[PDB]
Amino acid sequence: EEGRLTLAFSLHEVSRVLKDFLHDACRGDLSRKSEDPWRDLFLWAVLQNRYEMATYFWAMGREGVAAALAACKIIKEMSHLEKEAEVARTMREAKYEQLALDLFSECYSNSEDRAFALLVRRNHSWSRTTCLHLATEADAKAFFAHDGVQAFLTKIWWGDMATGTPILRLLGAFTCPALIYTNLISFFLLTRWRKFWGAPVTVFLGNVVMYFAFLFLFSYVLLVDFPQGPSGSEVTLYFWVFTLVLEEIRQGFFTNRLVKKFTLYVEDNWNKCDMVAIFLFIVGVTCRMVPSVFEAGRTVLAIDFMVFTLRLIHIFAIHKQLGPKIIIVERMMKDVFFFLFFLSVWLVAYGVTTQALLHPLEWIFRRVLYRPYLQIFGQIPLDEIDELVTFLLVTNVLLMNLLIAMFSYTFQVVQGNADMFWKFQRYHLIVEYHGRPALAPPFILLSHLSLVLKQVFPDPVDQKIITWETVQKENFLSTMEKRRRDSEEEVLRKTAHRVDLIAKYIG
Amino acid sequence: LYVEDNWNKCDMVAIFLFIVGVTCRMVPSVFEAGRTVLAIDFMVFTLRLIHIFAIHKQLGPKIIIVERMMKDVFFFLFFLSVWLVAYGVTTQALLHPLEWIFRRVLYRPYLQIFGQIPLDEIDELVTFLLVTNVLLMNLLIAMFSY
Amino acid sequence: RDSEEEVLRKTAHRVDLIAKYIG
Numbered sequence: 088e089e090g091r092l093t094l095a096f097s098l099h100e101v102s103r104v105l106k107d108f109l110h111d112a113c114r115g116d117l118s119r120k121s122e123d124p125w126r127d128l129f130l131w132a133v134l135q136n137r138y139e140m141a142t143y144f145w146a147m148g149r150e151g152v153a154a155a156l157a158a159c160k161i162i163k164e165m166s167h168l169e170k171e172a173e174v175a176r177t178m179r180e181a182k183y184e185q186l187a188l189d190l191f192s193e194c195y196s197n198s199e200d201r202a203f204a205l206l207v208r209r210n211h212s213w214s215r216t217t218c219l220h221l222a223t224e225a226d227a228k229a230f231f232a233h234d235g236v237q238a239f240l241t242k243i244w245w246g247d248m249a250t251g252t253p254i255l256r257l258l259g260a261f262t263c264p265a266l267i268y269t270n271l272i273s274f275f276l277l278t279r280w281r282k283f284w285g286a287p288v289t290v291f292l293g294n295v296v297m298y299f300a301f302l303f304l305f306s307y308v309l310l311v312d313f314p315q316g317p318s319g320s321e322v323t324l325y326f327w328v329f330t331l332v333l334e335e336i337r338q339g340f341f342t343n344r345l346v347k348k349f350t351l352y353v354e355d356n357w358n359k360c361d362m363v364a365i366f367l368f369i370v371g372v373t374c375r376m377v378p379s380v381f382e383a384g385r386t387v388l389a390i391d392f393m394v395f396t397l398r399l400i401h402i403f404a405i406h407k408q409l410g411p412k413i414i415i416v417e418r419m420m421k422d423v424f425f426f427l428f429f430l431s432v433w434l435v436a437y438g439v440t441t442q443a444l445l446h447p448l449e450w451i452f453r454r455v456l457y458r459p460y461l462q463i464f465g466q467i468p469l470d471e472i473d474e475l476v477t478f479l480l481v482t483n484v485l486l487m488n489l490l491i492a493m494f495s496y497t498f499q500v501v502q503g504n505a506d507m508f509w510k511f512q513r514y515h516l517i518v519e520y521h522g523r524p525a526l527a528p529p530f531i532l533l534s535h536l537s538l539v540l541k542q543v544f545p546d547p548v549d550q551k552i553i554t555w556e557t558v559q560k561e562n563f564l565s566t567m568e569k570r571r572r573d574s575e576e577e578v579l580r581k582t583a584h585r586v587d588l589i590a591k592y593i594g
Numbered sequence: 595l596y597v598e599d600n601w602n603k604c605d606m607v608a609i610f611l612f613i614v615g616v617t618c619r620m621v622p623s624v625f626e627a628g629r630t631v632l633a634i635d636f637m638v639f640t641l642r643l644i645h646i647f648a649i650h651k652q653l654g655p656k657i658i659i660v661e662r663m664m665k666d667v668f669f670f671l672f673f674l675s676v677w678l679v680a681y682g683v684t685t686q687a688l689l690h691p692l693e694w695i696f697r698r699v700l701y702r703p704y705l706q707i708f709g710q711i712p713l714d715e716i717d718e719l720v721t722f723l724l725v726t727n728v729l730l731m732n733l734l735i736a737m738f739s740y
Numbered sequence: 741r742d743s744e745e746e747v748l749r750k751t752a753h754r755v756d757l758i759a760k761y762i763g
Contacts, residue, residue, distance in 0.1 A: 306683065313690075389687040393722070396680040400673070408669050415736070416729045423728060465711055498736030576744065583751040590758040 105130070108164045109157055110224065113214035123149065126212065133158050136165070136178050145186070146564060150212035151205065151556045152194070152230075153221050155187030157213060160225035184229055193559045193566075195235040201552055203239050208552070219518075228507075231514050240517045245286040248273050261292065287517065290525035294334075295402055297528035301327040302395040309392065315384025316375035324375070328368045330532045335365060337535065338523055357401065364394030405516050407509075414508025415501035422493040430486030434459070437478030444475075601645065608638030666737040674730030678703070681722030 090100065102115045121127060125147035132141035141158075148154060162181050169175035194202045209215035222230050230236065241250045249257070252273060260266035260283075267279030274282050283289060305323050312320040339352035353362070367390070374387030403409040438459060458471075526534035571577070597606070611634070618631030647653040682703060691698065702715075 309687070313687075386688070389684065393680050393684055396676065400676075403673065409673075412670075412673075412729075412733055415733060419729060419732045420725065465709060466713065494732060494736070495739070498732075498739065501736060502740065579744070579748065583747055586751050586758075587754055590754045593758050593761050 108161045109213075111157075111213060111216060113216065123212065126150065126154070129154065129158070133161055133183075134165075136174075138181055142186075146560070148212075149553060149557060150210055151553075151560070152187040152190040153210045153213060153216070153218045155183050155190065156218075156221045156225050156227055156230060158183040159187070159227070160221070163225070184227065188230060188233055189563055190556075190560060191230070191233050191235060193563045194556065195233070195238075197559045198555060199235070199238075201555055202235055203242065204552055205556060206235070206239055208549075223518075228511060232510060236514070237510070240514055243287070243521060244517060245288045247282045247286060249286055249288045257288070258292075261289075284525055286525075287520040287523075290523055290527070291405070291520055293525065293527035294523070294531070295399070297531075298395075298399060301528060302392070302399070305395075306392065309388060312388065313385065314378030315381040316378065320375065320388075324372065327528065328372070330528060330535070332365070332368070333535045334528060334531045335361060338519075360401065361394075361398050364391070364398050367391035367394040404512055407513075410509030410512060411501060411505035413512065414504030415498070418497050418500055418504070419494060422497050423490050426486050426490040426493070430482050433478050433482030433486075437475035437482070440478075441475035604645065605638075605642050608635070608642050611635035611638040663738060667734050670730050670734040670737070674726050677722050677726030677730075681719035681726070684719040684722065 090103070098115065098117075105111075106114060125144055129141060129144040129148055132138075132144050145155070158181070162178060162183065166175055166179040169178055191202070191206070194205055198204075206218045209217055213221070219227075221227070244250060256272055260269075260272035263269065263271075265279075266272050267274040267283055268276060284293075301323075305327065308319055308323050311317055336352075339358065340349060342348055342351070352358070371388045371391040374384045377384055401413075404413055438455075458468075524531065524534045524538070596602070615632045615635040618628045621628055645657075648657055682699075702712075
């Protein structure tokens with residue numbers, strides 16, 4: 088209808104429907120028999136929400152796990168767009184991701200080196216797209232969780248057996264510039280140089296170091312900064328913040344509709360943490376751009392700097408140990424809120440009634456808010472309080488009990504997040520780094536200069552790997568099939584059918 | 595092999611304490627230091643003997659659990675202290691305050707955690723001192739249940 | 741009816757019956 092208005096189905100019609108759901112860079116003589124038909128058959132089945140014939144189709148298709156994830160995404164789109172909530176859930180019961188996981192599983196146990204090749208391909212079967220591209224575009228969480236997924240990631244983390252080597256030896260070799268040519272740690276001078284400054288652990292360390300020193304030095308110069316704004320502070324601005332915005336944006340601004348891309352860059356929740364610091368950067372910039380209020384010009388940078396600690400705090404996320412820490416904290420805070428508000432309301436009630444019995448703007452706000460909160464912190468000035476009990480007991484009791492009990496269960500949920508938020512958080516960070524330019528924040532200015540200057544200036548193996556996939560796939564099929572034949576319950580049922588038949592014959 | 599086992603290393607510190615205090619007494623130039631050396635060293639005694647509780651069935655698992663608890667506490671503690679330092683730096687800026695500076699920056703707030711709150715030196719960052727204080731205790735304690 | 745335990749019980753009853761007939 089809409090297409091007609093701009094001018095009952097079509098090749099153009101179904102093609103637009105597809106590109107709408109899969110959003111891929113993948114597109115499109117009715118007499119012409121079309122290529123690789125099992126594909127389109129799978130397509131039609133999935134749309135019709137017929138899991139079974141879909142599965143049979145799946146078997147026919149030469150494509151591997153990548154198609155399956157495509158199914159996952161289309162199914163997600165249809166499930167939320169489904170009207171009949173019963174039909175919505177039934178559609179929501181496909182588990183095509185589970186199947187794709189199976190394919191990847193037998194793929195890894197098969198080759199585990201050709202498998203790593205597999206996931207990194209461009210399946211022309213969806214217009215030469217990379218598997219993970221689909222994985223992301225589908226939020227392939229569980230698929231991201233197959234141990235091989237992490238295999239490919241960790242493998243690409245350094246490129247020079249970084250995972251195999253230890254961190255203590257890693258930083259030591261990072262200390263002496265010739266350690267790679269020294270052969271003390273695993274890895275001519277150009278080869279070693281490319282290796283050491285070419286790793287994602289490498290740039291990760293480098294940027295972390297440059298940023299930490301930026302934070303400490305700007306901290307130090309906040310003392311000299313104590314017209315609103317001195318010279319060296321302006322230096323620190325132009326020297327860290329400017330490049331940061333270049334460093335801060337660029338990596339997110341132009342990923343690979345420009346406005347849509349920008350929206351995507353400022354869409355993720357994790358970035359928003361930086362967003363506050365970015366706002367802190369510009370706001371403090373304006374404050375130094377103002378010597379009328381030196382006190383305020385100092386307050387602005389004073390508050391702003393803590394953003395530094397918050398953004399870097401993400402860095403603990405990559406480490407395995409802190410993997411689940413960020414996962415649990417948000418839940419804990421949420422649990423604390425709801426209880427805290429009620430607790431504070433009850434405390435206010437008891438304080439109000441107590442105050443009325445005693446019968447004794449800035450000072451009032453102080454004596455009403457700062458006094459009892461400090462009474463919670465061991466500052467009890469009896470000289471100002473000594474010449475409501477039911478509240479201060481029952482609320483004090485219920486509040487602590489509720490949040491703490493919730494938190495035990497919250498911690499159980501956190502264990503679930505250890506399984507979940509931890510590993511998932513690792514993968515996103517790994518993907519993000521690989522795209523981060525290697526040079527640290529100081530050298531980030533030079534890296535940006537070089538990039539802007541640059542802007543101003545197989546098939547046999549493919550078919551072989553595909554065949555590997557196909558063989559493994561049929562193997563998976565036969566494996567499940569033999570398991571089902573050996574269904575001991577099915578065994579008994581078959582035996583019983585034979586039994587009753589034979590008894591009838593004896594009769 | 596003899597100096598390979600982890601348990602022996604506890605003694606190793608005491609052994610080092612023995613030789614080091616030996617040298618300190620082998621030195622009358624600094625009586626104060628000669629006293630500080632044995633003073634510190636002696637506690638090694640308590641630590642090595644503390645193994646003896648290990649043989650008893652009741653304390654059998656106590657040493658097993660303590661190392662894990664300490665490890666769980668570390669990682670959380672470092673982040674918690676970092677956040678506390680952030681909020682304190684924020685406060686000092688508005689507050690506008692080598693040995694005395696180190697004192698007022700480190701001994702003052704740690705003793706503020708231990709009930710020594712000298713309002714005469716503090717009274718004429720909130721988001722931090724709340725959210726870090728919350729998350730830190732929750733994390734380590736939950737980890738500790740497990 | 742599809743009670744698998746009931747299935748087995750019924751099969752066994754048939755089994756013993758058929759065995760008796762064979763005897």
